Design an enzyme around this catalytic site. Structure first.
Site, PDB file in Angstrom:
ATOM      1  N   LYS A 109      31.584  42.437  44.587  1.00 17.07           N
ATOM      2  CA  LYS A 109      32.427  43.636  44.492  1.00 17.07           C
ATOM      3  C   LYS A 109      31.807  44.740  43.631  1.00 17.07           C
ATOM      4  O   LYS A 109      32.171  45.905  43.780  1.00 17.07           O
ATOM      5  CB  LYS A 109      33.829  43.267  44.001  1.00 17.07           C
ATOM      6  N   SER A 133      33.309  36.794  44.377  1.00 12.84           N
ATOM      7  CA  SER A 133      33.742  38.138  44.023  1.00 12.84           C
ATOM      8  C   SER A 133      32.692  38.972  43.290  1.00 12.84           C
ATOM      9  O   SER A 133      32.914  40.180  43.085  1.00 12.84           O
ATOM     10  CB  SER A 133      35.045  38.109  43.216  1.00 12.84           C
ATOM     11  N   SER A 187      39.754  41.154  40.516  1.00  2.00           N
ATOM     12  CA  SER A 187      39.279  40.414  41.676  1.00  2.00           C
ATOM     13  C   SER A 187      40.268  40.462  42.823  1.00  2.00           C
ATOM     14  O   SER A 187      40.458  39.471  43.526  1.00  2.00           O
ATOM     15  CB  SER A 187      38.975  38.959  41.323  1.00  2.00           C
ATOM     16  N   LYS A 220      31.434  40.839  35.821  1.00  3.52           N
ATOM     17  CA  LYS A 220      32.214  40.572  37.029  1.00  3.52           C
ATOM     18  C   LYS A 220      32.031  39.108  37.342  1.00  3.52           C
ATOM     19  O   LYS A 220      30.907  38.604  37.368  1.00  3.52           O
ATOM     20  CB  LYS A 220      31.726  41.418  38.209  1.00  3.52           C
ATOM     21  N   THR A 221      33.146  38.428  37.602  1.00  6.69           N
ATOM     22  CA  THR A 221      33.093  36.999  37.878  1.00  6.69           C
ATOM     23  C   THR A 221      33.351  36.703  39.348  1.00  6.69           C
ATOM     24  O   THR A 221      33.709  37.591  40.142  1.00  6.69           O
ATOM     25  CB  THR A 221      34.104  36.244  37.033  1.00  6.69           C
ATOM     26  N   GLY A 222      33.119  35.452  39.704  1.00  5.09           N
ATOM     27  CA  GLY A 222      33.484  34.979  41.032  1.00  5.09           C
ATOM     28  C   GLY A 222      33.848  33.512  40.995  1.00  5.09           C
ATOM     29  O   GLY A 222      33.377  32.758  40.143  1.00  5.09           O
ATOM     30  N   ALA A 223      34.716  33.119  41.934  1.00  3.36           N
ATOM     31  CA  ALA A 223      35.084  31.729  42.106  1.00  3.36           C
ATOM     32  C   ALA A 223      35.113  31.439  43.604  1.00  3.36           C
ATOM     33  O   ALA A 223      35.483  32.299  44.411  1.00  3.36           O
ATOM     34  CB  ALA A 223      36.469  31.469  41.508  1.00  3.36           C
ATOM     35  N   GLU A 232      36.930  39.158  52.908  1.00  2.00           N
ATOM     36  CA  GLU A 232      37.830  38.256  52.152  1.00  2.00           C
ATOM     37  C   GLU A 232      38.833  37.632  53.129  1.00  2.00           C
ATOM     38  O   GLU A 232      39.406  38.336  53.945  1.00  2.00           O
ATOM     39  CB  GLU A 232      38.563  39.022  51.051  1.00  2.00           C
TER      40      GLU A 232
END
Lengths: 265, 165
Positions: free
Chosen positions: A48, A45, A105, A209-212, A141
């Site tokens: 984004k 993510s 997210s 901003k994070t992502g997994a 996505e």
């Protein structure tokens, strides 16, 4: 306690994984510390931020309005879509979709926005336009989170992501209004508690901003600094680890804590 | 108390007031306004880059408004997931809910969203199912083989799948 690279070596040993890190001075663009900064990692993510950068570029050009309402359909809904699912019956504005994509997210929101910029190919074209020849988005996505080993699809490098974030947030490529908006969405991130925010001292600024992803992939991109002012960009990605989410979060937070402890050392 | 759970989701019913929902969910888990308008959104455990969650929609913004929509992700597990690409390919628009379940497997699906736009009438009821292959469901990460099947008035309107077979 350990120095940033010492902590990263500890984290790779403990996770049996691969960490990518860059710390970059926001004003000058100088790289202050780096680790595997030329290796590819799945963006998850974190892409984004670039997506909403591309959206804001269209706003600046008069080709898009943040107030424009998008009416979407059941077919558009994908896994992890709390805000866009809620608004299915009435639609969402472009600005609301960016807020959901960045702060929560929301995956369907990101797909809706991707359509407006020409899809993954269109976003990759935008990246090339701003001088990023490395970062690439290939899928929508939710497949972009697969994190298959050796897969170049939907990847960046820590060096390219840091440079691109610096371009979006501080160069002349977006208007001042757009830069403030993009940064505000990052300041308002709601899902990043367990990462750098968990070790951020009182009085510091953070926008992130994070992502997994699958297969242990986890990441964060952040602007942070003392005296409630952004001073540096920090990018930390993790890939190729069997460790639990708790462990992945703890290790990213630990690397962040080492960067903060050794801010001027 | 705990976070939002599948058990709490099942205990919350269409026709409940906001206070009834909050009392069951645990108000510390829930929010309204902002991104969620006059709905009540309640978080479970962290999962992926968000959380397992429920969202409850209401007939209006009034205090006596009743639950007319229930949605969740990753609070409910399928009882016996047997979906395949072949089975998904056999599903056709126009099928009834019973025909779809006979095709994809009776224990393959969970209810993603269910909304009664004419509550207390069932007219125009919309139903979204999430359906899973044998190892597809995940409550904490990302699905590995799933489908979204959606209905209006109990009749299938569309279908979409990811990573089947």
């Amino acid at each position: 306690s350990p120095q940033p690279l010492e902590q990263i070596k500890l984290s790779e040993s403990q996770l049996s994984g691969r960490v990518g890190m860059i710390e970059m001075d926001l004003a000058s663009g100088r790289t202050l510390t780096a680790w595997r900064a030329d290796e590819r990692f799945p963006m998850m993510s974190t892409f984004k931020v670039v997506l909403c950068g591309a959206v804001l570029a269209r706003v600046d050009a008069g080709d898009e309005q943040l107030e424009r309402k998008i009416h979407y359909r059941q077919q558009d809904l994908v896994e992890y879509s709390p805000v866009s699912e809620k608004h299915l019956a009435d639609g969402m504005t472009v600005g609301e979709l960016c807020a959901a994509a960045i702060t929560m997210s929301d995956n369907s929101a990101a797909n809706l926005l991707l359509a407006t910029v020409g899809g993954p190919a269109g976003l990759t074209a935008f990246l090339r336009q701003i001088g990023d020849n490395v970062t690439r988005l290939d899928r929508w996505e939710t497949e972009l989170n697969e994190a298959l080993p050796g897969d170049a699809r939907d990847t960046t490098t820590p060096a390219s992501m840091a440079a691109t974030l610096r371009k979006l947030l501080t160069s002349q490529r977006l208007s001042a209004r757009s830069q403030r908006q993009l940064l505000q969405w990052m300041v308002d991130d709601r899902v990043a508690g367990p990462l750098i925010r968990s070790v951020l001292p009182a009085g510091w600024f953070i926008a992130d901003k994070t992502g997994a992803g699958e297969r242990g992939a986890r990441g964060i991109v952040a602007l942070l600094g003392p005296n409630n002012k952004a001073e540096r960009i920090v990018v930390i990605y993790l890939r190729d680890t069997p460790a639990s989410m708790a462990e992945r979060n703890q290790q990213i937070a630990g690397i962040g804590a080492a960067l903060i402890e050794h801010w001027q050392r | 108390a705990g976070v939002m759970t599948g058990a709490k989701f099942t205990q919350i019913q269409f026709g409940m007031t906001r206070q009834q929902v909050l009392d069951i969910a645990g108000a510390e888990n829930c929010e309204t306004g902002g991104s969620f308008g006059d709905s009540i959104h309640c978080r479970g455990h962290a999962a992926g880059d968000y959380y397992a969650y429920a969202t409850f929609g209401f007939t209006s913004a009034a205090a006596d408004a009743k639950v007319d929509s229930k949605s969740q992700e990753k609070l409910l597990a399928p009882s016996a997931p047997t979906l395949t690409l072949a089975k998904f390919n056999q599903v056709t628009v126009g099928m009834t809910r019973a025909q779809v379940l006979a095709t994809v497997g009776q224990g393959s699906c969970t209810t993603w969203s269910e909304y009664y736009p004419a509550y207390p009438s069932t007219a125009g009821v919309t139903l979204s199912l999430s359906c899973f292959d044998v190892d597809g469901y995940s409550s904490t990460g990302f699905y590995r083989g799933s489908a979204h099947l959606w209905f209006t008035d109990g009749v299938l309107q569309g279908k979409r799948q990811w990573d089947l077979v």
